[PDB]
Every structure is written in C-alpha cells, then in structure tokens.
Design a protein around this ligand. Structure first.
Ligand code: FAD
Ligand code: A1AIU
Ligand code: CL
Length: 451
C-alpha cells in the first residue's frame, strides 16, 4: 500500500485524504488546529462559502454531496442592491437547476473530516509542521507549546493554506519562483442576526451584493437566517484621493457607522453589532501568490491555497481547492510513479490556477464597478442574446467558471474572445436596435468553437 502524509486538515487536505484512503492508500493527516468536532465552551464564529458546480462535483465524486447540501442554503440568484432602484434579483445561470449553495465552513470541515476518517485516514490534530529534511525524508512537527516530534515521510502533500509551512520548506531546496501580488483591498466580516434579516425582509435564498465602486459589501445566508457580510475596502487612502474611504479612516465603530449610513443606507439598519464587530474583528488581508512549480520531485506537492493563494472575489478558492484535490488523487492513483504524478498534476492544474487567479482579480470590477456603465448593460443584454442564439458557443464567463467544469484556462480563453466580441459589437452604438444581431452571431461561429 502506497503511503502519503498530508499537512493541513482543511478543505483540500481532507478531501484528498478521503479520495486516497478509499483507494487503499495509507493516509496520515496532521493539523495544527484542534479537532473542531470536539465541542468546547468557546463561541465558534464561522463564515459561509459559495459552493458551485466545480466544488459540488468534487464532493459528488467523493460521495459527500448529499450530506453537504443537506446543510446548505440554496441561492437561486444574485440580489443586487444599487441605490435609486429596488433590490433586483438576477437568477443564476439559464435554468432553475443552476444555483449556488451557501455552506458554513465549519459544517463543511466536519463533514469532510468525518468522511476522511470513514475512508480509513488517520487525522492527528494539535500538531504543526515546523520543518522538512528532504534529503533524509523526515519532517518535524510540534504542538503549541513547542514540543517537537520527528516523522519519516514518503510523499508529502502540502494542503496547509495560504501561509503553507510546506511551501516554506520547499522553497529551501527548490526555487519555487514566487511572485507575490499584494491587493490594496482589505476585508472585514460583519453579521446580520436572524431577527434583523427577518425584520427587513432580506431574502434568504439569494446572494446579496452592494456594489459601490472602489468598495462593496456582500452577504451570504446561513441556515438560521443570519447572514455573514463582508466589506471590501482599501487599507489606505491613496495620495491622489486623500478623502476616499479606507479602513485607516474608520478608526472606530462610530466612524464605521456613519460611513455605512452614508454609503450603504439600506444595509446599515441591519447591522446591529456594526460597532462591536468592526473593532473586535481584525481587518483581513488579500493577496495573489503565483508559483512556477508546485512540487519537489516525487517527494512533495502543494495544492489549494498552499499552491495558489488568490483573492476571494469570484468565490472560487474553495471550489478550486476541491477540484485540485480530485485532480491530485487521480494523478497519484494512476501514474507510473509519484514523480510523474506530481509533474502531470502541476502541468494540468498550474495554468488553470493562474486563470482563476486572474479572473478572480478581474471579477472585482465586475461586481462593484461594472454595474452602472451604459456600455456594460448593453453588452450583457447582447451577451444574453448571444447565449440564446449559440448556447454551445457563447456561455458567459461567470457561468463557465461557476456552473461548469471546463478548465479555468479555457473559460478565461473563451471569455476573452467573448468580451472583445461584445466590446467591438456595441462600440459606437447606444441601443440594441442599432446593433446587427446576425453580425455578432456570425462572429460567434467564426471565433468560438462549440462545446
Ligand atoms: C474572506 C474569504 C472568503 C472566501 N469566500 C469564498 C467563497 O465564497 N467561495 C470559495 O470557493 N472560496 C472562498 N474563499 C477561499 C477559501 O476559503 C480557500 O480558498 C479555501 O479554504 C482553501 O482551502 P485549502 O484546504 O487549500 O486551505 P484551508 O481551508 O485554509 O486549510 C489549510 C489547513 O491547514 C492548516 N495548517 C496551516 N498551516 C499548518 C501547518 N504548518 N501545519 C499543519 N497544519 C497547518 C490550517 O489550520 C487549515 O486547517 C474565501 C476566502 C476568504 C479569505
Ligand atoms: O459567487 C461569487 C461570485 C460573484 N461575482 N459576482 N457576483 N458574485 C462570490 C464572490 C465573492 C464571495 C466572497 C468573497 C469574500 C468573502 C465572502 C464572500 C462569494 C461568492
Ligand atoms: Cl476565493
């Protein structure tokens, strides 16, 4: 039986543990945090994640989809809150079977942890990876008190998140070619209670967006009708725009309150604990980290956030991580040897990871900026018309990323063709009546092969 050691009992690490263990691998999984299934008196605070078809299919392959969806809120569309107009529901995809699921991250982790153990994996909590000796095939783990433990390993899977200790160890023996692209936006997570969401008739079965240009809020529903709200806002005000909102100008909750009353007037009444949450929850940081290589020979490999930290603006980090896990398990299971498996996995997934990294960054202006420009609405109106005329050729990029399993690289490649096509077609035209619909449809057939 082939052996594997996995660092990080997160989403990708527990899914790949289950997939390999049920295939007969001997799987040991080490996690720095305690087991969240051991109930304590602490008040856990979990965010929700948007689970899309990519992630759902990965869970489906693992035999865990029904259990996860049993605990997920169905989001049938986007509820767009734009000042001046009532909230507008934009249904997802083209049919009523295309939805996104709001799943509590802790609920999901417990389902995955149970699933990995049922398949035969052994999970060891309260043990953080400190170092790896690749030449001697040994690694060093320690608890929170620093007591150290050495283990031999045969195959090392770094599924240990955006601050991967496995990545750090690999960069000591191989040039990973790291390029860190810092993001000027931070985020703050806020909360709407079930009482508040009911009192203001906030729709539970939808994903809510408050676009506002350089900043925005979004909210995802929980089973108990609470919502977790995320504010995206610049860390610092630029010198060019010294009065522009930023976290540095919100020194306390009272400043935050006045800011929300002015810029999010229909949302502020629902944020009962805005002041307390703002000061007691830390401001998160966002970054994109691109690596040229994800593996060291056949000894170690990265996946998930360990391999490709990305901005959350597309709701695809978890979905990509689960897709990564399926691909890595497939390659390891059928390859001639671990070295071939890790090279083939990297060669398959690295261009797709770059794609979703770039599309997630681009999708920020799509949510907050590109909703009030006249050209955008005519392009989307023309994009929907082309999606009906050529449904196997023109699929909007959001639907390809979210509701299909087409490789991220093809989704971005086809999306660029589609975006330029719509851009040229609507240029110097103000109405759909002044646009020739068969000329755009002919370009769809010339430049977009059917799927
Ligand atoms: C604010 C925010 C919102 C997001 N929203 C979405 C969304 O709506 N949809 C979506 O698809 N994605 C979303 N994402 C992205 C998603 O959360 C991550 O991409 C996903 O969790 C990656 O899974 P992973 O298993 O690679 O890493 P993680 O889930 O972070 O797991 C890493 C694990 O490794 C452990 N670990 C770390 N270091 C060590 C060590 N040295 N030794 C041992 N164990 C270690 C950690 O404790 C953790 O258990 C969001 C991210 C953020 C920050
Ligand atoms: O589903 C999406 C993509 C989308 N783009 N336009 N409308 N939504 C989506 C985008 C972002 C998130 C998210 C990010 C950080 C924190 C909390 C949630 C969730 C989900
Ligand atoms: Cl993400």
């Amino acid at each position: 039986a082939r052996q594997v050691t996995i660092i990080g009992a997160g989403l990708a690490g527990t899914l790949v543990a289950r997939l390999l263990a049920r295939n007969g691998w001997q799987v040991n999984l080490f996690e720095r945090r305690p087991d969240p299934r051991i109930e304590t008196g602490a008040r856990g605070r979990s965010i929700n994640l948007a689970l899309a078809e990519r992630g759902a299919h990965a869970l489906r392959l693992a035999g865990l989809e029904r259990e996860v969806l049993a605990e997920a809120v169905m989001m049938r569309g986007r509820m767009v809150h734009v000042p001046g107009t009532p909230p507008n529901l934009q249904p997802y995809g083209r049919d009523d079977s295309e939805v996104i699921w709001s799943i509590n991250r802790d609920r999901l982790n417990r389902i995955l942890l149970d699933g990995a153990e049922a398949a035969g994996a052994s999970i060891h909590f309260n043990l953080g990876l400190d170092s790896v000796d690749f030449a001697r095939q040994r690694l060093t783990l320690s608890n929170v008190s620093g007591e150290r433990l050495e283990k031999r390993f045969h195959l090392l899977i770094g599924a240990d998140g955006c601050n991967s200790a496995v990545r750090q160890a690999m960069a000591s023996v191989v040039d990973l070619g790291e390029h860190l692209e810092t993001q000027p936006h931070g985020y703050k997570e806020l909360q709407i209670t079930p009482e508040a969401s009911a009192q203001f008739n906030l729709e539970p079965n939808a994903l809510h967006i408050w676009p506002h240009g350089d900043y925005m809020c979004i909210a995802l529903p929980n089973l108990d009708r609470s919502f977790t709200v995320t504010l995206f806002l610049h860390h610092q005000s630029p010198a060019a725009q010294p009065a522009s909102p930023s976290f540095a100008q919100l020194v306390d909750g009272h400043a935050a309150r006045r800011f929300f009353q002015r810029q999010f007037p229909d949302l502020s009444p629902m944020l009962d604990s805005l002041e307390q949450d703002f000061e007691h929850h830390p401001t998160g940081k966002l970054a994109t980290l691109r690596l040229t290589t994800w593996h060291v020979g056949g000894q170690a490999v990265l996946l998930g956030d360990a391999a490709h930290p990305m901005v959350p603006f597309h709701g695809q980090g978890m979905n990509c991580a689960l897709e990564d896990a399926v691909a890595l398990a497939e390659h390891l299971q059928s390859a001639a040897d671990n070295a071939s498996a890790l090279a083939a996995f990297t060669a398959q997934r690295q261009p797709d990871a770059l794609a979703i990294q770039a599309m997630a960054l681009e999708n920020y202006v799509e949510m907050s900026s590109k909703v009030a420009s006249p050209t955008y609405l005519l392009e989307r109106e023309l994009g929907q018309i082309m999606a009906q005329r050529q449904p196997t050729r023109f699929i909007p990029r959001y639907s390809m990323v979210t509701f299909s399993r087409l490789p991220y690289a093809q989704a971005m490649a086809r999306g660029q063709i589609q975006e330029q096509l719509l851009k040229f077609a609507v240029a110097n035209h103000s109405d759909l009546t002044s646009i020739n619909l068969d000329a755009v449809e002919h370009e769809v057939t010339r430049c977009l092969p059917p799927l």
